[model samples]
Target chain A: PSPYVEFDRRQWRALRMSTPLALTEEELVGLRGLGEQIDLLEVEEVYLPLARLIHLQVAARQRLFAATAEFLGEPQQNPDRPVPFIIGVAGSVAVGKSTTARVLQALLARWDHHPRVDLVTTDGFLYPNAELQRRNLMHRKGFPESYNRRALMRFVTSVKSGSDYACAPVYSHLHYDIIPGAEQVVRHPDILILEGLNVLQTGPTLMVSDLFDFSLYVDARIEDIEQWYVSRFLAMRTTAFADPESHFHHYAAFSDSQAVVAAREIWRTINRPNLVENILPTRPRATLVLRKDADHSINRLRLRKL
Target chain B: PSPYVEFDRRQWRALRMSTPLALTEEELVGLRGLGEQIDLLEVEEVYLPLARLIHLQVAARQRLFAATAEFLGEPQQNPDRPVPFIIGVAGSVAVGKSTTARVLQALLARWDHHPRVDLVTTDGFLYPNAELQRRNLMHRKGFPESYNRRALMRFVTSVKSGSDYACAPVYSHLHYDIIPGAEQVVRHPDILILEGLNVLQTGPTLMVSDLFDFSLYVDARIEDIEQWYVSRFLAMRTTAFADPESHFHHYAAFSDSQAVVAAREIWRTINRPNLVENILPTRPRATLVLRKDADHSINRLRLRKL
Candidate 1:
C-alpha cells in the first residue's frame, strides 16, 4: 500500500465492509421520532471497521512518505512512532455526540489492532472558572469561540507529532472548570476520538481546519435539539442535579414545574441562541454529516467528496 | 453624520436610499456576487456608504477599546491610537480584489470629507521573487505558509499605531516579484482596504490576523472563477505578457495559440487548485460575502451580524 491514499468518497467506498449492521424499523422510527434511541449496534458493526481501515491507511501512507524522503536523498532513519488517528465529533447541544463517541470508542477497541482508543472532549480545554468570570461569560459555556482554541490546537498538534504520549487537561462536571496542570495522558493510541462543539472553526486570520484528517458532525434540526436539551436538563434536575454533592444541587431543589421553565430559559438564553449564531452556519465545514432522525436514529449521512 | 458612523443592518439600510446614489440591480448583484462579476458598481454605491459606516464603527470601537486600556491603567498612553480601520478583502484568485481595491481608493478619495483612503495588498508583503526561489517555493506563492507572516503582521501593527506614513514593501506584477524597498505608505487614511488571497489567515504560532476590523470575501463557484482566471491570463498574455520590456517577456514570445494553452494550464494547475485549497475555505472568516451566480452576476449578499 502506498503512503498517499488519496481518499475522496470514491476511494472510501472501494474498501471492504467486514460486517454491516442493518437498522430495524423500530430502531429507525425511534431515531426518526427523536426519542433518544441510539443504534449502538451499528456503531459497533460499522464504525469499528471504518476506524481500523483508517488506521491501516495512515500506517501505509507513513511508510510510503518515508520512502520518498529517502528518494530525495535525505532521511531513511526513524525512531519508533505511531501516527495517531484523531476523530473529532462535533454537533449542536443534545445531538447525542457524547453517546455516539462512547459507542464508537468501545467498538473501535474491540480488536487488538489498536486496543487503546483514547477519547478526549473539549470540555477540558475550557478556561478555569476564574477566567470565565473575568471574561464576563460565566453563563455562556460551550460556544466554540469560548474555548481556548490555541491551547487545544497545540495539544492536537503535539499528538499528531506521533509521539509516545500526549496529555490533555482534565475537567470536572461539578465545578465546570479545567483542573489546571492535571491531564489525561493518552499513550500511542491507534485511534483517538475528540468530541465537542465548535472544533471546526478556522482562525479569524488563519486556515486551521485543514489540520483535521477526518471530522464527523452529529446533526439534527434545531427545533428537535432544543426539545432534547430542555428535556435532558429537566430529567437531570430530578435524577442527578439534586444529589447532595452535585454542583447543580440548587437546580435539583427547584419545583418540578419550575425546573422545566428554568431549562427552557437556559436554552433560550445561552445554548439555542449560540447555535443559531455560531453552530448551524458551520455545518458546511463537516467532512461528513451523520444526520439523526427525530427519534435519535442515524437516518441519513452526507459525505463531502472532492 | 461625520465621516464615520457604526450602523447595524437597520441603520445601514436607513442610510441606503437616502444616499445620493442608489444601488442599481446590476450593482446590487455585484455586491452579492463574489468573483465572476467584479464590477465597479458595488464599490461606488454599496461600499461607499459602508466606508462611512466603518468610519463610525472604527471610531466608536477604538474609543471603547481605549477605555478598556484606560481601565487596565496601562502606562502606554492610548496605545490603540490611530485605530486604522483595517479592512481585509479575502477571496480566490481572479476575484477582482485588485479592481476592488483600486476602485475603492479612487472613489474614496472623491469623498473630500474622508480624503485619505490608503489601500494595501498582501501581495506587497510577500518576499522578493529571489527569496521565494531561494526557499524553493517559487511555485507556491500564495499558500499561507510561504510568505513572511511575521513581517506582514508587524506592518499592520505599526500602521495601527498613530504613526504617520508607516511604510510597507510593494510587489510588482510585471516583474512578478517584490521590488525590495518599494513602499506603500499608510498615511492617516480614514479607511484602509488590505486585499489578498490570505489576508484573513494569520500565522499559527503568531497572532497576526486579530487586527482586522472587518473582512469581506469575494465568493463564486470554483469553475466560474477558474474560467475567469484563464480568460484574464489570456488577455494579459496578449496585451502585457508580449511587451518586450514586460517581465513576462519569455511568454510574450509565445504564439497566440501557445499562450492560450499556457494560460489554461496555469489556471488548471496553479491558480484554480490553489484557490480551492487556500482561498475559498476562508469565506466563513469574512464579515461579508459577495456571492456570484452562474452567469457571473453578484446577486446575493450574506452578512454575519452579531
Candidate 2:
C-alpha cells in the first residue's frame, strides 16, 4: 500500500547477491568519519548492492538516451561521452551521509562500465565566513538559507549538462570557511556523487534534486544522531581540533564535561532545528532511505516503489 | 508508434466541448503581435480546448499535492497556496510563440476556478547589449548562449516554488537591450505562461523547462517563418523603428527594397542559423506542437500522449 518497499538488514543483504566486495580495511578507514564505523562486511552487505543498483540504473538511462535520440531523428550528441548519472546524498550533519557517499563513490568506480566517479560536497557552495557574518547568519551556518542556493543549482546544472569540465569553490573545514578563489575542478565523469545536508531539498524553481538520477537519504532517530554528533565532537577535540591551524583549536583544551556541554548546545541550537524544519521534510523525497542503528550500521533500507 | 496523438483543426475544436469564448474582439486584437492575425473563432476553437485541458491538468496537480501530503503523514504545508501551474511556450524568433502565450494567459485567467494567469517573455532574461558586446556575442543574440540562463532558471524556479512575489528584469525592444534598474514584479498568479526562444533548452544541472508543468512549441515551416520575419521587420520600420529612441531608427528612412534587403540579410545571418542549430532542435521536446500554416493559422496540434 505504501509507495516504498521496506527491507530489514538481512532482507536487504540478500539483495546483494553475487556482487563482490571490492573495498579493503585500509581504504574504508580513510573513507569513514572519525567516530563512524564501517567495514568490508557492511560494504558487502549494504553498499555493494547499492552500487550494483546504481550501475543498473545508469545502464537503463543510457538505453533511454539512445531511444530518445533515435525518436528525435538525431544520432547521439556525443557518442563517446554519455551524460553522467548524478546521485545525491542527503541527511543530518552526523548521520554518516558523507561516509556513505565516499564508500559508494569508491565501490561504484570499481564497476567496469563506469570507472569515472566524482564526489562534491555542498559545503563548498556555502557562503564564505565573511559573507555569513556580514549577513548576521554566522550562528545559522548549516541552515538552508546560509548557502548560496543559486550557485549550487548552477554547478549541478552545468555538470549535468555534460560539460567537458566544471569546477566548484572549495570549503576548508580546518579554517571553518570557504577558501577564497580555491576551486575543485571536475572533469567529465561517468558518475557524480553530490553529498550535502539539504541536497534533496527543493527551491523556488529548479532544485539540485531535479538533476539527480538517484538519491539517498541517510536517516536515524534524532536522539541517536545527537549522540553521534557529541561523540564525533569529543573525538575531534583530540584529532583535528588539536592542530593549531584548526578552526576549533580553542575547543581542544576543553575539559571532557566542557566539550559535552558545548557540543550539546550547538546541536540543540542549530542542527536540531535545521533537521526538524528543513532536512527531515525532504527524507520522503529521496529514492532510497538508509536507516542507521545506534551502532552506526545501516539496519533497514527503504526503496521508493517505481 | 508515435508518442503524440495528432489532431486537425476540426477535431481539436470538437474537444472544446462547452467552454465559452470569453474574450472580446478588442481584447483579441490587443493580445496579438504586429503582423500576426488571430480571431475570436480561433480562440473558441483552438485556445478554448487548450484552456480546458490545462484546467483539468491544474486540478489534477492540486489533487496530487493533497494525496502526497497525506501520504507523507503531514497536512498540507500551506493549504491556501497551491503551487502555480507553469506552462512554457518555445519557438523561433518569428514563430508567434509570444502571441500564443498571451492568448493562453487571457483565456486561462477566465476559468472560474482559477482567475489569475501571468505571461512572461524570456527576452527579459537576455544579457544586456553592453554585456553581449563585451563578450563579443552581440551577433549571437537570441541564441541560447546569449541569455542569462541562470537568472531565468532562478526566476521560474522561484515562481514555481510558490513564492508570493518575484520580479524579472524588463527588456526594451526599441532600445534593444535590458532596461537598467527596471523590473516587472509578478505577484503569485495561479498560472504562469513563459514564452521564449529557448525555454525548452536544458543546461548542465537545472533548466527553465524543468519547472514547466506543460510546454508548447509554436512551429511553422522555415521558409514561411523567414517570410514572416521579413514582413514583421518591414512593418516595424514605420512603427517601432520610426521612433528616435528605437535602436534601429537609422533604418526607418530606407527605401522599401533596401529595407527588404536588410531584413532578409539579418534573418539569414542571425535568426536562421540560431533557429536551425538551437531552437528547432528543441521542438520535439515540447508537450504540444502547434503547427502553423503560411497564413499564420494553426492547422494541426500534436499533443504528447500521456
Candidate 3:
C-alpha cells in the first residue's frame, strides 16, 4: 500500500556493502549538533548506505545527461561542466537534519565521482529580521512565508540549470537576522546539499524541491523533538545567552525550571505549530525519510520506490 | 609519581565486574546535557565501575559508623538512620558534571545497600541574583564568592551528620537566581550526591569538601569545553531564546557566526576566568577525576590512592 520501502536499522546498515566509512569520529563530532547522538558506528551504518545510494544516483543521472545529449544529435553541451545534483534535506527543528546534511556532504565528497560537494542551508534564504518585523511575521519566523521563496527558487534553479555560479544571502544566527550585503557564492560542484525545514514544501507555481535530484526528511516524534528542543534551550542559557550582546541575553539568567517552562511555551506557540502545519505535512513528499529514535539514532529508513 | 591511581577505559570497564548496566538509553538521553556524548557503552564502561566503587565505599563507611557508635559506649546514636555518605561531583560549566552525577545517582541507587540515594546541586547555594548585583558580584556569578559558602557548608554538615532531614534553598536556572523561601528537603539517605562547580573548593575555615566521603572532578581541556559551550549556545538561540518570557529572548535572533563570537566572548570573560581562578584549582583536591575526551566521553579516570 505504501509507495516507499522500509528498512530497519540492521537492514539499512547491511545495504552499505563495501563502502568504507570515509568519516572519522573526530569529523563526526564536529559535524553533529549539540545534544545529537551520532558516532562513527552511526555514520558507518545509517549514513554510508545513504551516501552510496546518492553516489549511484548521481552516476545514473550523469549517464542520462549523456544520453539526452546524444538524442539531440549535438555535441555534449557544457562537456566540462555537468549540471550539479541538488539534494534537499528537510526536517523539523531539533531532529538533527543539519547534522545529516553535513555528514552526507562529507561522505558524498569522499567518493571519487563527486569530489566537490557543497552545502547550502535555506536559513540563508530567510527574510531579514527587519523585513519580517515590517511584515509582522517575526513570530512566524520558521514558517514558509517568512522565507524569500522566489529568491530561494531562483538560487536553486540557477544552480540546477548548470549556471557557472549562484549566490545566496547570508543569514547570521548570532544576529538572528540576515546580513544585507553578504552573500554565499556557490560555484558549480558535482553535488549540492540544500538543507532547511521547508525545502520539501510545495508552492503554487514552483517549489525548491522540484529541482532536487534527491531529498531527505529527518523524522522523529513530536514529543521527542519537543524534549530535545527544551534540553537544548536549557543548555544554551549558560553558553549563548550568557553574552550580554546576545539577542536572548535576558534568558541567560533563567533558572532551569523557568527555561523549561519558556521553552515548552515557545514550542507550543511557535515551533510545534510550524512543524505540524508546515513541516510534517511535507514528509511524505521526500524521496527518503531518516526516522529517528528518541535518542537521536536512526531506527529505520524509508526510501521511495523507483 | 602521583597520589592518584589512573585507569584507562578498558581497565575501568573491566572493574565493573558482575554489575549489570542499571541505566537505559532512554534514561541516559534524559541525563546528558546538550553536546555531551554518553551511551550505554560509556555508562557500562566508564560509570558502572565508578558506581560499584562508590557502593563499596558506602558499605565500608557504614561499618565504620557502627564501630564508632559501639566505641562511644552508647546505643547506635540513631539506630534507625545511618549517617549519609556525601559524594561531591565538581566540574567546569559545559563539562557535564550534572550528567555524571545523575548517572551515578541512578546506578548507585540500584545497589540494595544504598536504596535511598538523593542528589543535590550546589546551584541552590548561589547568592540570589539581586544579592550578587548588590555585592557587584554579578560578573563573578560562578566564583566562590558568588556562593553562600557558610550556608552550603552548614547544609552539607547537617546532612552528613545524620540530621533527620536538611533543607537547601532552591535556585532557579530560569530566573538565574535563588528562589527566596523555596527549599529542597533532603531526608536521611544512605548516600547523597552533592554536585556543582565549586563543591570541591576549599575555604579558610570549614569547607564542603571536608564533609565529603568521596568527590569527583569532571575534567576536560579548556578549548574543548569552550567549543562545547559555543555549540550549546548556538543551539539555544532557536529553542530557549525563542520564548519572549525568557531573559535571553534577545539572543533568539543571532546568526550562527554571531552566536559563536558572542559565546566565545562570554566564555572568555566569565566562564573561562571562573574555571581557571576558582573551579580548576579544586580539581586536584577531589577524590577522583574523570578526564573526558573532546567528545565528552570519559577517556581516563584518576582515583586518589587509598
Candidate 4:
C-alpha cells in the first residue's frame, strides 16, 4: 500500500477504461456526434468499461459499510446488505463531467437493488448571487471559500452518522440561485450522486469524500477542453442562451455571425483561466478520471482500483 | 515530532517534584490538602511553555488564513492584526480538566491583550435527561453518540465562521437537564477556553476542537484517574449527589464504604474501557498534553511544534 500519495503522471497513464459494454449497440450509436477532427471510437471502448468498473467499486464499498455497521452494534446493519453509495463527479468546465454524472446515475439506477438513485450537484452549495455580491466575491465564484463548507460538511457528515433521513439545500438552475430553506430529503435512497468542480476538497477534520463513497473526474488536454469550450459556447449562445429564463440572457442579443467569435474570446479569457487555476489542480484527488479525445467523447479512463 | 501521544509509562519518568516558586506561591501555599495538591509548581515550568507554544501556533495559523484570503483575491485581510485564539481542555470524569481549564483561563486573562478571554464547557451541551431517554441512548450516556452533536456543531461552526454572535445551550449538572431555550450567547472574544470530557470529540466534520485554535489534554496515570474518580464519588455521596434537585439522587444514599466499591466497578467496566478504547486515542490529535502527577500537579508538557 502507498504510504504517501504521489502525483506521478505515469500512474495515471496506466489507467485503462473499465466502462461496461452493457449498453446496447443502439444506445452507443445514439451518442454519436460530428466534429471534423473528433473520433467516437474512444467513447465506446473507454467510457463503457470505465462506467462498469465504477458499478463494481461502488457495490464493494457499500458492502464494506454494512460490515462496519455490524461491527458497531447495529442489528439492522447486515454484512450482506448494500449501504447507500454517494458518488461525486468533478472536473473543469467543458470536461463533460455533467453529462458523465447523468449517464452514470441513469445506468446505476437500472440495477434492481438500487433503483432509486438521486443526484444533487454541488451547485446547491453555492451561495446566492446576492450573497456573493454582498461579500464582494462574485468574481471569485467556484473558489473553495466561496461555498459554505461548514453546511456542506455538516450535511454529508449527518448522512454518514446514520440519520434516518438526510437533506441538502436545493439549487434552482432556472434562477441560478440556491432556494433558501428548500431541502431535498432522501429516505433510504440507494445512491446520491454529487457533481461539482471541487468535490474532493477537505475542510477542518472532514474530507469532502468522507461522505462520498466514490467519485470520478473528467480529464482532457487543456487544449482539447479549450477547443470544446469554444464550440459549446457558440452552441449555447444560439440555443440555450436564447431562452429568456437563462442566466446568459445578454448572449441572446448577439448575431449568429458574431456568436462564434464571442464564444472563443470568452473561452480564451474567462472560462479557461478558471479551469486552469481552480478546477484542474483537483483532478489527481479523484477516484477515477475520464480522459477525453481531442473531440468531446471519452478516450481512455484512469481508474484507482480498490 | 512524536507521532504517538497519550501518557506512556516512560513519559512519566519525566515527571518531577516542583520547587513551588510560581507567581501564585503565596495564595497556593496558604491552601491545604487537595488545594495544595493542585499546585502550580509544575504548572509554571511545564504548562506555561506549553501555552506559549500554542500562542505561537495560533499566530501562525492566522497568518495562513490571511495568506489564503489574499490568494483568493481579497487584499483586505490584515496579517499584522491580532487573531482570535481559542483553547479547549478535555479529559475523563474527575481528571481535573475543569480546574486546569479554569486556572488556564485565569492565567491567560492575565496576559497582555487577553481582556476578552472567555471560558465554556461541554457540560452545557448535554441534553435534558427526559430527551435522553426519549432517544433511548441513556445507558450509553457519555458515549460519542449521546450528545446533541448537531447543536454543538452549529454553535462552534458559527463562532469559527466569524459570525458576530453565537450561543450554547445551558445544562444543569445537579438537575441533569437542559435549561429549555436557555443559551449563553457568546459575543466575539479575543480568546475562548472550552472544557469537557468529549468536547474534543465530534463524530466527524464538527469536532468542537475544529473551532479551537489550540487544545490540551490533561494526562494522568489511568490508575490515578481511577482513584480520583472513586474519591470524588465518595465525596459527593452526601453533598451535591444527595440533593433533592439532583437527577442522580439514587447514588447519594449509598454507604460511603460501598460507594468506593461501586465507583471502582463502574470505572473498570465502563469508564475505563471507554477511556482506553476511545478517549485516549484522541491524545495524538491534541496540540499539547499536560502530564499530571498523582496529586493533580501538571509536572510536564508536550507541545506540538511547527
True contacts kept of 3: 0.00
Per-residue lDDT over A1-306 for candidate 2, one digit per residue giving the tens place of the 0 to 100 score: 233557788766544254255667776665555324566567767877677766766765565444433332332222334577899999999998878888888878876778999999999999898899899999998888799998998888778667777889999887888988899998869899999997987654446776787899999999999999999899988788989988689999999899999999999999999899889988867778999899888898876432
Candidate 3 on A237-289: residue-level lDDT in tens? Answer: 88877889888899988899899999999999999999998898788667789
Tens digit of per-residue lDDT, candidate 2, span B218-248: 9999999999999989988888899998778
Residue A132, candidate 4: alpha-carbon lDDT: 92
lDDT of 1 by residue, B111-163 (tens): 55456778888888777778878988777888776677878877776665445
> In model 2, what lDDT does residue B250 have?
85
DockQ score for model 3, please? Answer: 0.01
Select the stronger candidate by lDDT from 1 and 2: 2
C-alpha lDDT (0 to 100) for residue B134 of candidate 3: 96
Per-residue lDDT tens digits for candidate 3, residues B77-150, read: 22434568889999899898888888888788877888898999999989988899999999888888898988
Model 1's CAPRI class? incorrect
Model 2, runs deviating above 4 Å? A14-36, A71-80, A245-247, B1-306
Best by the TM-score measure:
2
DockQ of all candidates, in order?
A: 0.03, 0.03, 0.01, 0.02
Better-scoring candidate (DockQ), 2 or 4: 2
Q: What would the TM-scores of all predictions be? A: 0.48, 0.54, 0.48, 0.48
Chain B TM-score for each model? 0.77, 0.92, 0.91, 0.80
